[PDB]
Structure 1
Amino acid sequence: QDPLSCYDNFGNRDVAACARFIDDFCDTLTPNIYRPRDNGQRCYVVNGHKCDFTVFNTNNGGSPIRASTPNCKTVLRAAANRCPTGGRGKINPSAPFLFAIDPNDGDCSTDF
């Protein structure tokens, strides 16, 4: 977990309710192959709000690649333990994938 950055302190929702979904998100979305600058996401409903998870290939070019399941868990657990309103990061500075865990208002039915 380096870099590891927290979202700001203005959010209304706590990340602790989202930690329960880290394993499911990492297990299901990391085996996919992602093109450079593409992402995969999942949305989970909890406590009248939602938890938005992202895996993002930060590479600008090169081959489409799959992500690391254990690295996803290490990063997102660190974010959940260190960032009360959620956060994002990579396993190490050179790693291609960024992972994010984001508690948000709303639900998983909107914007499509």
Structure 2
Amino acid sequence: QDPLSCYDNFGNRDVAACARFIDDFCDTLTPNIYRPRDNGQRCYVVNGHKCDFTVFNTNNGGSPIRASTPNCKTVLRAAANRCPTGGRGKINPSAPFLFAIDPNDGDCSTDF
């Protein structure tokens, strides 16, 4: 979990409501192959708001690659423990994947 960056303190919503989905998200979306600069996401509804998860290949080029499931879990647990309004990070600075855990206003039926 380096870098690990918290979202700003102006958010309404607390990451504690989202941490229960970390295993489900990491288990289901990290085995996929992601081209450079592509992402995969899930949205989960909770009481009063939603939880948005992201896995993102930060590489600019190179081969499409799958992500590490245990690194996803390590990073997102660190964000849930250190960042009350959610956060994002990598397992170490040379790693290609970024993982994010983001509590947000609204629901999962919007933007499509």
* 3-state secondary structure, aligned to 1:13: coil
Task: Flag as ranges the 4+ runs of structure 1 deviating above 2 A.
Answer: none
CA-CA distance at 1:80 after TM superposition: 0.1
Structure 2: which 5+ runs fail to align?
A: none
What TM-score do you get using the length of structure 2 for normalisation? 0.99
> 1:9 Cα deviation (Å)?
0.4
CA distance in 1, matches of 2:60, 2:13: 33
Instruction: Measure the CA separation in 1 of the matches of 2:108 and 2:10.
Output: 21
Deviation at 1:48, TM superposition (A): 1.5
Supply the RMSD in Å over aligned alpha carbons.
Answer: 0.3
Q: What's the offset of the Cα at 1:97?
A: 0.1
Q: Give me the TM-score of the superposition, normalised by structure 1.
A: 0.99
Gaps of 5+ in 1: none
Secondary structure at the counterpart of residue 92 of structure 1: coil
Aligned length: 112
Pairwise CA distance, 1:12: 0.4
Cα separation, 2, equivalents of 1:36 and 1:58: 6
Identity %: 100
Equivalent position SS for 1:16: helix
